[PDB]
Structure 1
Amino acid sequence: SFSGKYQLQSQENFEAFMKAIGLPEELIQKGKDIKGVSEIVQNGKHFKFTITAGSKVIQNEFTVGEECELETMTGEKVKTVVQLEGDNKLVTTFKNIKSVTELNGDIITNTMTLGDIVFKRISKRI
């Protein structure tokens, strides 16, 4: 069940992922200490998610199966549609990033693999 407000506990590769895409060392060292609340609201196919990322709040929505324009960090828009397996895995290919987001009980992993980089957030359902 995806309807919940999931706050960040243990963050693996924030320095290696953010410098590989295009972000500053000041916002990497500021947002590593800040535990960000990553909201997800499932209706069914529509998913309205609100990520509180450091200072600025970045909110977007995808429809499962049908094409969706989500904001990428370096650019502006990316056509990348999510497939839902088992009521737990949200799998998509973003800007060369395999975003594998599995729900295990009352947590959520977000494993964004950019080639050799493995960016693993572990955010608990709160």
Structure 2
Amino acid sequence: TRDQNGTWEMESNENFEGYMKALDIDFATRKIAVRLTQTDVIDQDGDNFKTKTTSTFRNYDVDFTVGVEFDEYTKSLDNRHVKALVTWEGDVLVCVQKGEKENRGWKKWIEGDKLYLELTCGDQVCRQVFKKK
């Protein structure tokens, strides 16, 4: 077949390092690049091609129901088992992850056009802000 439409996930990657070295791509960009999965999305109408290649590091999925506490394995992250509960404090999605780490959790809330995410573990607070795409 000539029909390549799809979302394609890298299964294996050989001498990627050689190919970038030939492109004169720098060492810092290369040591990252070799630690990533590529995803190629191809949208194709006969001779018309649209191609997007993304390079991922890790994926953190969580499915939950507010108020229903759940067992979470943080594979991808620190690979620990916690005991998670998400509730509403007003506008704010609050999650408490019980386990070995003190003060471990997160807050997620909307203000205006933006999403706010506070990540907390111990006395470290990471704050992130997102725009809609």
**In proportion to residue count, which structure has more strand?**
2
Give the number of the structure whose alpha-carbon radius of gyration is greater: 2
